[PDB]
């Protein structure tokens, strides 16, 4: 594989070099002209060897730094968890507030901090790449996939993109508020005292590590639990379904919109079944198109309905695969990054339906679906769609302001929260600093992969799915339509998959939609049936969510310094060394009043001085939590009492006397006065 | 030459020592001279090492209360501290810059405890009076 | 118990394998000084309250058994 891959790259660098011969100036043909495009893009070959060498040294380092992240247990350090196994079990599966925050402040002190000046490095790197490739930015370069120019209609510029999905995200805000209200209320019932009706959402409680799905959320949020969910993986056991006839289930479906037949060596070639222990075999379902006339699946399926919905769902991939096989090979792909996953999801969509499960057998016929049922499936599809939404929207926005450099380095933190708490309505349980380096913790962020393909196929999907559902001629609501035995649908559905990249992406849209650009009105109509039952649910609770709330407020308590009303001249600067000073002064404080009144020996430090909302006026709030229990927070009463009992040897610290240092809760007295006798 | 001295150590060479007088210079309502002090007093060496090297040097190095290593503890408050570097132990800072750091930011440290350049004694650092202003 | 360099903090080194090797093979007195440091700042730290408890609980057994 890695000689193969080798040459391969060494053959499509040469022919790059080779197409430089023919500007693009001088072309005539559009296809000519795109495949010429495709075939001329430097990529980082346009930096020098140096920078080319760190960029790939960077890369690679922050890849491996995300894999071989360890996370240690405070109380037995001799234990550590990665992220794939353990981490992720205890995000998505525990109940305990304590045990999710320092599972989440963990993973976010000890990788976060590795990564951050990495990533300073590939930014200023990677806008050094852009620039010289004639782009404005790294940002403009991603964007760039969008891009369609002279067609005279169909012209879609980069910068119109940001446009796009600012417009299209102001119509979906509505419904979010809605669903993060009722997500709010239906928490309190499960994290009491710890979430606030009127204030966000705490990060560590979204049921994943960085909230990007809500998914598992779902059994805290169920709207009926008395009512099941429609599962058939138990008829399929009962039918004796293994992992061949569900493929061929699939095909029937296919076919019965008109889509060809599975070609002959695909049964042959395909691996529908895990090869066992004997030999060894990677189990990610995936399409691969050889080239030639071949196409497989890889996939080690078993008998569930979630791999029923993944066999679809690939089997959609190959047959979009299959569309543009007469189209040279540099369009052997979709019209986009997000076209592809669109048209493997809608096969999905469409197969989970209680109809098609009705028709096909799986689901008794005597079967009378609930209104009841339909809110749980369609909440269901929201925590998974709807969720990953606004988080994609600001997480893309962040890269895209930071490549752009409208975001200072100093402020990357300060303003990534910032849009987190008025975007997505997540709140962060503890303050961070700009020495971590949150948003590169995730997988898409350190691993150089663009993250607005996840949104914009998240739309795609349903302006397909309605389209689809206008052929079939289907009355009822959206998320009951099916496409099956509609051959005016599948007409409509190969047109455009057969223009594969040889078009632009918005013209493929016209051929299916029937628009030129993204609308989110079919998301919308599709979410109606939940998006009245949550609106009627939302009567007496406050719908929305405050910026200023957040989980450490309430045990914070605000110091206010004023150096130059004290001092005058001879004012020294407040950098971040006198910060640490402070902090420190702080623990010491702290280690006196639990030495001298409770007589326990506490090992604070001054890492365990928690400060935010830092200011130029030098007012900041802080908190004091325990040794190594991030979980653990003093109350603010001993943390008054122990200010209360050093605050002199913090006065004389800085050089200042109870009007420049202000505790705003904490008033000095300043003595009785004697008496002549 | 066959045995050794108990005396000798690595880090001698590098070592700035510390003798501190509450008693004379406070006299009574003289505080005692717990952990939670010594580890006041790292973090302030720690703080200054800061301030030489941002102010100076130009380099944003992230000491610790970790980092101002003590040795040899008296009941005299008198001690040896050496600084290393932030998380490489084979590197001590020379002592002509920690000399240098602590004149720099004396002030800081003496005010920190209520001290005042007689009773927070360096050994290898002498103060400076000031020159005495004289008439037309 | 692991010790896990600075620099890469995301390999580390337990006992037998590797930091025996370094201690024992090494002629860089950094590296060296590195291992003996972090062996005995990651392990003993971790050690110490335990052995207290063990020495209290020992002393007592043989106190109890007429020693
Ligand atoms: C870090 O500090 C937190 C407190 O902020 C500690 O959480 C506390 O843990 C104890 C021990 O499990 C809890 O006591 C138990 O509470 C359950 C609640 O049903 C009760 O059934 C048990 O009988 C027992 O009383 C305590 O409630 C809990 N407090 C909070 C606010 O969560 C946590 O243990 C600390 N972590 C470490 C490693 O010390
Ligand atoms: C921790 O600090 C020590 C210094 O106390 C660093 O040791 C120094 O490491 C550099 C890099 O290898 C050495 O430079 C090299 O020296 C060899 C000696 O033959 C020479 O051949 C090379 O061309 C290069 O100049 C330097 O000599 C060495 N200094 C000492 C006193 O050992 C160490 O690298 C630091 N550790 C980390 C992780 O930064
Ligand atoms: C642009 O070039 C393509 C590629 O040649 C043309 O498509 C046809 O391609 C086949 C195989 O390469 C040729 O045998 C045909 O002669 C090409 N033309 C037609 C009409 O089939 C395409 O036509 C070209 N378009 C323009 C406007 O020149
Ligand atoms: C790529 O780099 C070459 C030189 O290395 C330069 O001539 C060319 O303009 C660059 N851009 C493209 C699109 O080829
Ligand atoms: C597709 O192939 C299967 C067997 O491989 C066959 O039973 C089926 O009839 C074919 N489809 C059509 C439309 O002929
Ligand atoms: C389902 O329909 C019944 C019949 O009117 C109604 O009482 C009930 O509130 C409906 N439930 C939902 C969730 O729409
Ligand atoms: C589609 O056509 C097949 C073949 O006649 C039939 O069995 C099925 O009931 C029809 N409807 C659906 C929803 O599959
Ligand atoms: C003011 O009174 C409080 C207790 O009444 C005392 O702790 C504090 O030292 C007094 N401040 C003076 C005397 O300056
Ligand atoms: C003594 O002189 C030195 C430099 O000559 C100066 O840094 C220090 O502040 C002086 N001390 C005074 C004026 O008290
Ligand atoms: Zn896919």
Redesign the pocket.
């Known amino acids: 594989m890695n000689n193969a891959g080798d040459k391969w790259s060494a053959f499509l660098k040469e022919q790059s070099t080779l197409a430089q011969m023919y500007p693009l100036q001088e072309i005539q043909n559009l296809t000519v002209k795109l495949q010429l495009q495709a075939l001329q893009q430097n990529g980082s070959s346009v930096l020098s060897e140096d920078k080319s060498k760190r960029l790939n040294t960077i890369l690679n380092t922050m890849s491996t730094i995300y894999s071989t992240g360890k996370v240690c247990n405070p109380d037995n350090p001799q234990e550590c968890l990665l992220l794939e196994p353990g981490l992720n079990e205890i995000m998505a599966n525990s109940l305990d507030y304590n045990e999710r925050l320092w599972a989440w402040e963990s993973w976010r002190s000890e990788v976060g901090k590795q990564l951050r000046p990495l990533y300073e490095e590939y930014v200023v790197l990677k806008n050094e790449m852009a620039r010289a490739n004639h782009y404005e930015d790294y940002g403009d370069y991603w964007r760039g996939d969008y891009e369609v120019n002279g067609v005279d209609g169909y012209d879609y510029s980069r910068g119109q993109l940001i446009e796009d999905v600012e417009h299209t995200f102001e119509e979906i805000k509505p419904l979010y508020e809605h669903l993060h209200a009722y997500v709010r209320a239906k928490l309190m019932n499960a994290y009491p005292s710890y979430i606030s009706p009127i204030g966000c959402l705490p990060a560590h409680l979204l049921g994943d590590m960085w909230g990007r799905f809500w998914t598992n959320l779902y059994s805290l949020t169920v709207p009926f639990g008395q009512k099941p969910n429609i599962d058939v993986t138990d008829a399929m056991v009962d039918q004796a379904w293994d992992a061949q006839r569900i493929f061929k289930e699939a095909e029937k479906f296919f076919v019965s919109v008109g889509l060809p037949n599975m070609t002959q060596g695909f049964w042959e070639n395909s691996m529908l079944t895990d090869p066992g222990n004997v030999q060894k075999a990677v189990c990610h379902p995936t399409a691969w198109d050889l080239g030639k006339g071949d196409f497989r699946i890889l996939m080690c399926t078993k008998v569930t309905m979630d791999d029923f919905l993944t066999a679809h769902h690939e089997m959609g991939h190959i047959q979009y695969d299959m569309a543009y096989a007469a189209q040279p090979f540099l369009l052997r792909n979709g019209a986009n990054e997000g076209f592809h996953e669109a048209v493997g999801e809608i096969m999905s969509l469409s197969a989970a339906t209680p109809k098609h499960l009705k028709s096909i057998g799986l689901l008794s016929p005597d079967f009378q679906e609930d209104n009841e049922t339909e809110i749980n499936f369609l909440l269901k599809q929201a925590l998974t769609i709807v969720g990953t939404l606004p988080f994609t929207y600001m997480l893309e926005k962040w890269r895209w302001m930071v490549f752009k450099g409208e975001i200072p380095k100093d402020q990357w933190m300060k303003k990534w929260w910032e849009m987190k708490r008025e975007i997505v309505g997540v709140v962060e349980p503890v303050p961070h600093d700009e020495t971590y380096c949150d948003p590169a913790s995730l997988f898409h962020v350190s691993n150089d992969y663009s993250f607005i393909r996840y949104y914009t196929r998240t739309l795609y999907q349903f302006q397909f799915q309605e389209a689809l559902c206008q052929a079939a001629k289907h009355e009822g609501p959206l998320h009951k339509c099916d496409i099956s035995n509609s051959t005016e649908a599948g007409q409509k559905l190969f047109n455009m998959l057969r223009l594969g990249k040889s078009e632009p992406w918005t013209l493929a849209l016209e051929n299916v939609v029937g628009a030129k650009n993204m609308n989110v009105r079919p998301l919308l109509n599709y979410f109606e049936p939940l998006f009245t039952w949550l609106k009627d649910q939302n009567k007496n609770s406050f719908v929305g969510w405050s910026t200023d709330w957040s989980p450490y407020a309430d045990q914070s308590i605000k110091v206010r310094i004023s150096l130059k009303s004290a001092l005058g001249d001879k004012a020294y600067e407040w950098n971040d060394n006198e910060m640490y000073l402070f902090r420190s002064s702080v623990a010491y404080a702290m280690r006196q009043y639990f030495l001298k009144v409770k007589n326990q020996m506490i090992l604070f430090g001054e890492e365990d001085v928690r400060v935010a909302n830092l200011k130029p006026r030098i007012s900041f709030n802080f908190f004091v939590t325990a040794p190594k229990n991030v979980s653990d927070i003093i109350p603010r009463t001993e943390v008054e009492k122990a200010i ?1 009992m050093s605050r002199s040897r913090i006065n004389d610290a800085f050089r200042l006397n109870d009007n420049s240092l202000e505790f705003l809760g904490i008033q ?5 006065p004697n008496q002549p006798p």
């Open positions: 209360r000095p007295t300043l003595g009785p």
